[PDB]
Amino acid sequence: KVFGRCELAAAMKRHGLDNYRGYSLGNWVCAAKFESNFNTQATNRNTDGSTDYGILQINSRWWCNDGRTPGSRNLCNIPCSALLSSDITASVNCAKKIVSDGNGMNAWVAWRNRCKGTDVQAWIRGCRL
Numbered sequence: 572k573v574f575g576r577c578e579l580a581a582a583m584k585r586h587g588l589d590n591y592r593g594y595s596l597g598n599w600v601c602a603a604k605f606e607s608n609f610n611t612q613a614t615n616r617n618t619d620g621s622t623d624y625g626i627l628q629i630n631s632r633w634w635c636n637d638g639r640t641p642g643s644r645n646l647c648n649i650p651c652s653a654l655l656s657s658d659i660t661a662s663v664n665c666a667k668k669i670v671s672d673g674n675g676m677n678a679w680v681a682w683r684n685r686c687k688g689t690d691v692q693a694w695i696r697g698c699r700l
């Protein structure tokens with residue numbers, strides 16, 4: 572499922588991301604934008620052979636189980652599959668653990684590189700929230 576910009580913000584907000592660990596709703600929408608382009612089914616192979624999954628491209632080395640990542644962890648105790656469904660619950664829940672991990676939203680390289688310090692409020696401009 573490809574979410575619309577405000578439709579993702581709404582779902583995100585309903586699942587308690589709005590200001591989670593201090594990161595306002597605009598940051599999470601910006602990060603989704605650049606990680607998956609609002610598509611739940613986005614996957615991408617990292618060079619180490621782990622795979623990034625979902626709206627927020629959550630990595631299998633640490634956070635989910637895909638059975639094809641030698642030496643990895645499944646710290647969100649989910650199949651990476653869960654991160655690709657229309658229902659963003661698993662994704663949001665697993666984002667919450669990642670962003671709590673000590674490094675904040677920097678855990679997402681695209682957010683650091685493309686969202687950090689930008690007018691992130693733009694991403695929620697004009698949404699019924």
